[PDB]
């Protein structure tokens, strides 16, 4: 990125936003003045045979 403002702060990074037909049209506008509802992404079980790392 020759152009692009490359900020001198790590925690103040500029992060771009992408949109989707279903996210924008088929989803409920769940970002409100109460709270934002967001999806749950599950990750497989680490069976009751857990050795270590």
């Amino acid at each position: 990125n020759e152009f692009d403002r490359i900020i001198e702060n790590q925690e103040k990074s500029l992060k771009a936003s992408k949109s989707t037909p279903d996210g924008t049209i088929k989803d409920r506008r769940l970002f409100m003045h109460h709270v934002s509802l967001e999806p749950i992404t599950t990750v497989p079980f680490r069976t009751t045979k857990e050795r270590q790392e």
Binding site: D22, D27, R28, H34, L37, P39, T41, P44, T47, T48
Partner: protein, 211 residues
């Protein structure tokens, strides 16, 4: 059996990617993946006749992977969109199996199933489909009488999702809120499980806010 669950677990792991979820939605055409998923989940609970979960089993982790994949798909905007247009029968099966499972039976399966229903409720049509399903309010009451705190938490999270947003608002949602077990939600708002106590507190604020 063992091989089937290993492949399903692998698919559950990679399904956390949007790119993989998009790729799964086309496959359902040739191999009815979501149509046979519901049948496999239905077959599993039917097989637990006079018994509760066995866990650490090859069959247990197969259906966990199935309900985990359905959740991870529903977590993606086009995934929940696909499910409510194409796999309405799978949604029927999830809702049916939640009411068919007795309290304390298949706790981890019920949580995973409740998480996929919350995800599909993020989609406008998905919210209507779930809330307008037969015996939905009696099911919410039934699931809140479960002794497991994690199950109760995910029922409250689904109820919160249903409470929020218009839903016509002209006594269509006004009667939904009044018909909830407010005494149980109150009891869970003073719970010793911090995650459950905060979900019931948040839901109580939302019920009071819209009253």
């Amino acid at each position: 059996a063992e091989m089937g669950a290993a492949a399903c677990t692998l698919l559950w792991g990679v399904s956390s990617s949007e790119e993989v979820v998009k790729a799964i939605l086309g496959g359902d055409k040739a191999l009815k993946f979501f149509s046979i998923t519901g049948q496999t989940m239905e077959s599993f609970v039917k097989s637990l006749d006079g018994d509760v979960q066995e866990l650490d089993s090859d069959e247990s982790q197969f259906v966990f992977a199935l309900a985990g994949i359905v959740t991870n798909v529903a977590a993606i905007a086009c995934g929940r969109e696909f499910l409510v247009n194409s796999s309405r029968v799978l949604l029927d099966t999830i809702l049916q199996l939640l009411g068919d499972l007795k309290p304390g039976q298949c706790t981890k399966l019920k949580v995973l199933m409740l998480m996929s229903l919350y995800n599909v409720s993020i989609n406008l049509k998905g919210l209507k489909y779930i809330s307008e399903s037969p015996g939905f309010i009696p099911l919410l009451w039934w699931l809140l009488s479960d002794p497991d705190a994690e199950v109760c938490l995910h029922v409250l999270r689904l109820v919160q999702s249903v409470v929020l947003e218009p839903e016509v608002f002209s006594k269509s949602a006004s009667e939904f809120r009044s018909s909830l077990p407010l005494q149980r939600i109150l009891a869970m708002s003073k719970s010793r499980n911090p995650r459950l106590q905060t979900a019931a507190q948040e839901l109580l604020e939302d019920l009071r806010t819209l009253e």
